[PDB]
Amino acid sequence: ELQVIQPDKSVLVAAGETATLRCTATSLIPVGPIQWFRGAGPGRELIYNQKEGHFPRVTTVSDLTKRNNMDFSIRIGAITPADAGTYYCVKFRKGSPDDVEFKSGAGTELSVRAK
Amino acid sequence: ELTQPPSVSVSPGQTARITCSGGSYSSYYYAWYQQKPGQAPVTLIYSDDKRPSNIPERFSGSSSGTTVTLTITGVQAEDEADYYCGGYDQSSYTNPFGGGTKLTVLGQPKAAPSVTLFPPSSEELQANKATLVCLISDFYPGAVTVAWKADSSPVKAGVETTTPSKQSNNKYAASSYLSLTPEQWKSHRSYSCQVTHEGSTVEKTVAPTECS
């Protein structure tokens, strides 16, 4: 059974720098997109979506167009204290009306040192 | 490998289903592609069930078990085409396609072919070959039998071509060319194609005589 690994429990970064949030998957089956969120509640905030959408602050560490790719780590540029919080890497499987959440990493606590 | 039926048929306004087998719901994404002849395919459905904005609401897709299905809800005569299923198989990093399914619309009742005959041109005859052409115009359904006769049944000197179902009237048209030497053309007299079709009670022969 597929695992989503967030290797880093916490990340400390200076304001204005690039934060690297790491995530790998042990398999690409079952099929379905990876997404990043801040928070794990119902009010959680979408940070990156493999399927669709524009996320200009977000760069991917690896080439996600590589058929082979299993690295879903992201970089968030010009970080501010407003960016701090817990970030979760999430695998969805295909589902009929909607895709459904399948596996999650254990989270990454992003801390920002001001100024 | 992905497998789909060679053909499917539907009355206009009705709902048609076309399914590919040989995939696996958990290790594939599927798409559907429409092609008229030897022209660029058009993507109808991607990620199993998603429709690009430019594609009519009557096309939908689904998938489960070993199967993927394109549904067309309100078949129109202009949907006459070949429909390909295309998978991405995540287990092997490959992109299998089915052989394609032609959608035949029934719209039409039987329509007998108009049959026409054309003898070789004098122009062609100088060049040292005689081509004889039998035209079957604006008939339905596809199946037809053309036999050539120099009063004797000639075989293996003829080749046929068919249009695709016409986008407006849902007819086919068929040509058969008989190819002979002029030597051969000049020693015989009666040229005829005999056309057998469901819309014809009995066969229609059409003929010329060489000199006339």
- C-alpha distances (whole Å) from B84 to each of A52, B70, B81, B97 are 25, 10, 10, 7
- C-beta atoms of A31 and B27 within 8 A: yes
SS3 A100: strand
Chain B CB contacts of A95 under 8 Å are: none
Contacts of A1 (CB under 8 A, 6+ apart): none
Transcribe B53-100 into DSSP letters: TTS-TTEEEEEETTEEEEEEES--GGG-EEEEEEEEETTTTB--B---
CA distance A36 to A6: 11
| Domain ranges, residue A78 | 3-115
A22 token code pair: 């790491």
Angle among Cα B71, B76, B78 to the nearest 5 degrees reads 110
- C-alpha distances (whole Å) from A3 to each of A10, A23, A24, A70 are 19, 10, 8, 11
Angle among Cα B41, B43, B46 to the nearest 5 degrees reads 145
Q: What resolution does the deposited structure have, in angstroms? A: 2.3
Residue among B90, B91, B92, B95 with most chain A CBs within 10 A, to mutate: B90
Chain A CB contacts of B93 under 8 Å are: 67-68
The coordinates were experimentally obtained by X-ray
- Does residue B141 have a cis bond before it (omega within 30 degrees)? yes
Q: How many CB atoms lie within 10 A of CB B81?
A: 21
CA distance A48 to A102: 17
CA distance B99 to A25: 34
Chain B CB contacts of A51 under 8 Å are: 47
B115 phi and psi angles, rounded to 5 deg: -105, 135
CA distance B45 to B74: 17
- C-beta atoms of B90 and A94 within 8 A: no
Work out the end-to-end distance of chain A between its first and last CA atoms, rounded to an integer number of angstroms.
44
A vs B: CB pairs below 8 A? 22
- Structurally, how many domains does chain A consist of? 1
> Which residues of chain B from 47 to 66 reach within 8 Å of chain A, CB to CB?
47-49, 62
Give the pairing type, strands B7-10 and B101-105. Answer: parallel
Are the beta carbons of A94 and A32 closer than 8 angstroms? yes
CA distance A18 to B106: 62
Are the beta carbons of A110 and A84 closer than 8 angstroms? yes
Transcribe B100-154 into DSSP letters: -EEEEE--S--BPPEEEEEPPPHHHHHHT-EEEEEEEEEEBSS--EEEEESSS--
Domains and CATH numbers, chain B: 7-105 (2.60.40.10), 114-206 (2.60.40.10)
Q: How far is CA B65 from the centre of its chain?
A: 31
Contacts of A12 (CB under 8 A, 6+ apart): A111, A112, A113
Q: Residue A66: closest CA among chain B residues belongs to which residue?
A: B93
B52 token code pair: 């690009």
